[PDB]
Amino acid sequence: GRKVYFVGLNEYPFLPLVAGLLRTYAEQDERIAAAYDFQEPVFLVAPVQEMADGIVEPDVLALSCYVWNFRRQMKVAKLVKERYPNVLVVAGGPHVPDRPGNFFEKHPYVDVLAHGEGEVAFRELLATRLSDYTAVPGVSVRRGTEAVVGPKAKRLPRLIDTPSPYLLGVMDGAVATCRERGLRFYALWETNRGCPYSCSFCDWGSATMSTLRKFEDERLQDEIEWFARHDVEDLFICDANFGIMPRDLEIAHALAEARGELGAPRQVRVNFAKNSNDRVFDISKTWHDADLLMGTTLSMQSTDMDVLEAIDRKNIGLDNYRKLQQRYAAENIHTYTELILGLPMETARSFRDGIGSLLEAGNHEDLRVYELGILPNAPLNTPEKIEQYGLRTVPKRMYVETPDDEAETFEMVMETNAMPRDAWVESFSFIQAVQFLHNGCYTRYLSIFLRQEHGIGYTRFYEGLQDYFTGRPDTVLGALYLRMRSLYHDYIDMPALPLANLVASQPDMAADLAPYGRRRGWTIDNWGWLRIATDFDRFHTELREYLATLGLDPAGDARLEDVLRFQQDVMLRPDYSPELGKSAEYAHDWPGYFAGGLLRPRRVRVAYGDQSFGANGRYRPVPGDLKAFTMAAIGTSYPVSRMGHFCHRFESAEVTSL
């Protein structure tokens, strides 16, 4: 038969869902099923030469192209086309340009591009290859080096009734392949397709600004059971806005029941709906109780009205955000908020003010920031919009590498009309410090106390930290701010400094963290937290000196001394023993205060008895074991770990009046 090869490389093990969807949809044509021999998908990373050599006698080479695999898959296609002149090279995925232009001049070894959702176009291509391509909807066809655009794509109907690659068993080989090689994997799952909104930076599922289409109910329920029956522990749901549809609560309950009855799945990653509502809360409560929840998305991208207008995004208001934070915090349900640095119209002033406003509104635990990437088919990637807002980009490698044509690259915004490059660098350093100091707890409780009892706003506190300590190179915190300043300037100037391995690519920063573990995906956030952990006592000595510059010398303020001791003691330290615990005495009931109660000068004994850390309590500290300390203190670098980390859980500690 005509051998069909799929290549869709992922750095982390994700099951090849696209290959399964395209094959099983196409196999509904009995002539296609009989004529074509679909090979096992290539989705685990291997050397380019080795991947090309594994493609033997191909009739069709199907490339599933994303920012993380486009260049290597083009190079494989180049090598395969040299060996097999008659192979049909078809590239789809969100990195395929909507407007190909001179694409085939750069990639003459590619024959057909598929745009957006690919089921119909791929099935029509395979059928046409058997018949006695420019008539196929949803594709562009190479003619010489020119791109001939075919008819517009045919989307699947509002109710998507297509074969499931999971239920048909065509994902079995990939699952076994991961397990044979000792790899944990994510199963990818869709319950619907599209996003109804229009954020200009986004290209979610190649289907933003789209009417929502649902996968049929019975297929989804059967797939839930399939995941549970096959011990698929890690499930990644691809929906843009989970909770946006009424049935999403029923889906959440069905996943919780499957977890309860069969033990799988164990964790569910999903992006929760932009217009967060009671259904998102009910889903989150359900999955929190079932230990499935990985954080409730309450993302903003920006808080500035001009920025939000420029990117066509409406957010929940700040006061409504505050009410959400209060409701989730009361249930101990973890939420997180994403921001993007360098959006149109964002100034360094508006960016820092927005960060402070989110802390003011009650998010102290989980703020996440991304560099703005220009995606090929995002609305922002037009000459008009790039010109309108003055977006300046630099090519940025994703990974440490090797020829340039095998290094994956994206275009990273690092300057706009509103944010000069220098302001971008300092703003990025600012939010990293907010993450490891505030989300990381080191100064979170001091900052809250200073805000609520001494009138020091959140933005002002962390601006002052940066302004003061950047002028003191020999301090713990000053060294971090200055190293981040040079790192991000090099990051702009040197494209090879990778997005996904930045800390690991710097020998000094990698050496800082070497006693704590061997990781390729250390974040700057992790690095700052562990650098402070290393020089913890001196950090607090120097912190007292910064407080004196605010007029708040602790040597004359007994209450400030008291909260500083609480702030020091609450942090998890390498010598902590779950068998011994950790206790101290204070002049105020700090646990009750930071739980939301009134500040009362009540002399207390606080006894910390933490046995484990992390979301599921699956990291146990071992005194003297820096590797076990790191897992309990900060968890994994990927995925982001912020539930149950950093500090002792004083809300459960034994607090006794003296």
CB 344 within 8 A of CB 310: yes
CB of 364 to ligand 5AD, least distance (A): 19
Largest interatomic CA distance in the chain: 92
Strands 187-189 and 234-237: parallel
- Measured CA to CA, the distance from residue 569 to residue 101 in angstroms comes to 61
Q: Is 430:422 a contact under the CB 8 Å cutoff? A: no
- Contact pick of 375, 465, 484, 615 for ligand B12 (by CB under 6 A): 375
Distance CA 4, CA 462 (A): 56
Which burial class, exposed, middle or buried, applies to 153 when counting CB atoms under 10 A from its CB (0-12, 13-18, 19+)?
A: middle
For CA atoms 473, 476, 481, 483, the dihedral sign is: positive
274 binds, among ligand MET, ligand B12, ligand 5AD, none (CB under 5 to 8 A by kind): ligand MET
3-class state of residue 654 by DSSP: strand
**Interacting positions 501-560 with ligand 5AD (CB under 6 A):** none
Site string for ligand B12, 441-480 (x = CB under 6 A): ----------------------------------------
Positions in 171-210 near ligand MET (CB under 6 A): 204
User: Which two structure tokens, joined as six digits, stand for 422?
Assistant: 């220098």
The residue number with the shortest CB distance to ligand B12 is 92
Q: For ligand B12, which stretch binds (CB under 6 A), given 88-96, 357-365, 413-421, 542-550?
A: 88-96
Contacts of 176 (CB under 8 A, 6+ apart): none
Q: Report if residue 14 touches ligand 5AD, rule: CB under 6 A.
A: no
Task: Tell me the three state secondary structure of residue 208.
Answer: coil
x-or-dash string of contact with ligand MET, 270-289, rule CB under 6 A: -x--x---------------
202 binding ligand 5AD? (CB under 6 A) = yes
Rule CB under 6 A: is residue 109 a binding residue for ligand SF4? Answer: no
Identify whether the C-beta of residue 264 lies closer than 8 Å to the C-beta of residue 232: yes
CB of 332 to ligand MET, least distance (A): 22
Look at residue 208 and give the partner it binds from ligand 5AD, ligand SF4, ligand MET, none, a contact being a CB closer than 5 to 8 Å depending on partner kind: ligand SF4
The residue among 87 and 372 lying less far from ligand 5AD, judged by its C-beta, is 372
Q: Please give the helix or strand (H or E) that residue 488 lies within, else none.
A: helix 476-493
Cβ burial of 389 (10 Å; 0-12, 13-18, 19+) is: buried
Is 40 a binding residue for ligand 5AD by CB under 6 A? The answer is no
Of ligand 5AD, ligand B12, ligand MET, none, which one does residue 206 interact with (CB within 5 to 8 Å by kind)? Answer: ligand B12
Q: How far is the CB of 262 from ligand SF4 (least distance, A)?
A: 31
Residue 202 in the binding site for ligand B12 (CB under 6 A): yes
Pairing mode, strands 367-371 and 335-341:
parallel
Q: Which of 375, 317, 305, 376 is nearest to 344 (CA)?
A: 305
Rounded-to-integer distance, Cα 286 and Cα 28, Å? 38
Residue 65 assigned as binding residue: no
Q: Of 27, 59, 119, 542, which lies in the binding site for ligand B12, with binding defined by CB under 6 A? A: 119
* Binding residues for ligand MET, total number by CB under 6 A: 7
Amino acid, res. 417: N
Binding-site member from 126, 202, 341, 355 for ligand SF4 (CB under 6 A)? 202
Residue 370 touching ligand 5AD (CB under 6 A): yes
| Residue 423 is a binding residue for ligand SF4 (CB under 6 A) | no
Among candidate residues 443, 445, 478, 449, the one with its CA nearest the CA of residue 462: 443
Among positions 228-267, residues that touch ligand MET (CB under 6 A) are: 240-241
Task: Kindly tell me the sign of the dihedral angle through the C-alpha atoms of 492, 496, 497, 502.
Answer: positive
Residues β-bridged to residue 397: 409
Q: Is 374 in the site for ligand B12 (CB under 6 A)?
A: no
Among residue numbers 228 through 257, which ones bind ligand SF4 (CB under 6 A)?
Answer: 240
Q: Output the CA angle 489-495-498, nearest 5 degrees.
A: 90
Q: How far apart are CA 200 and CA 160, in angstroms?
A: 27
Residue type, 298: L
| Using rule CB under 6 A, residue 586 touches ligand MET | no
Separation of alpha carbons 287 and 331, rounded Å: 12
CB of 238 to ligand 5AD, least distance (A): 11
Contacts to ligand MET by CB under 6 A: 204, 240-241, 271, 274, 297, 299
Annotated binding site: 10, 64, 66-67, 95, 118-119, 195, 199, 201-203, 238, 301, 338, 373
Binding site for ligand 5AD (CB under 6 A): 201-202, 271, 299, 301, 338, 340, 370, 372-373, 375, 378
Binding region for 5'-deoxyadenosine: 201, 301, 338, 373
The site for ligand B12 (CB under 6 A) is made up of: 10, 12, 14, 17-18, 21-22, 62-64, 66-68, 90, 92-95, 114, 117-119, 121-122, 188, 190, 202-206, 236, 238, 370, 373, 375-376, 499-500
Binding-site residue numbers for cob(II)alamin are: 10, 64, 66-67, 95, 118-119, 203, 238
